[PDB]
Design a protein around this nucleic acid. Sequence first.
DNA 1: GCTTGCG
Length: 181
Amino acid sequence: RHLMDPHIFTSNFNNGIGRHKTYLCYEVERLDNGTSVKMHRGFLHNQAKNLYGRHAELRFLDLVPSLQLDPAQIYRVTWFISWSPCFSWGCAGEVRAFLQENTHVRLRIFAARIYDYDPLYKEALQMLRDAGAQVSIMTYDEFKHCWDTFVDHQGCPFQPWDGLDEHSQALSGRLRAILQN
DNA sequence: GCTTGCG
Ligand SMILES: [Zn+2]
């Protein structure tokens, strides 16, 4: 019930426009068979770097204790993040360590955009996959699902930006190439 | 303001 500003959303999750900020919307569903259904769904951004900072993914790992997940149970955690996790600042590694430590959890990452500023972004994406995280590019369905679930839309159905699907394809192309090796 | 924080 803590919802995101529509302009905030559209200007950060646009897969054709980079921003100097990162948003991470998350869900936690529990599975006691196949019945995940829907259940713990908030969102957050990074602590800006002011001379270091704390990347959005670490802040997620920060708040895991507060979710009070039952370690006997198995959960799917879903992220929709405006930038692909980095490697260099230790995010991919920290997440791997978290998945090893918390084997009850099944992680699913959709990214709006690929953070290729990090020269080691490919290593980050492959390492996450190897750790058993599903690593994916947001398509229209996932942009819509965050709009529907996280955004203070006030009954307005999502209006996709020009070139959403061209960019979504382009990036899905690059990402699959990367996970092939 | 222009935006993969900076000036
Ligand atoms: Zn990071």
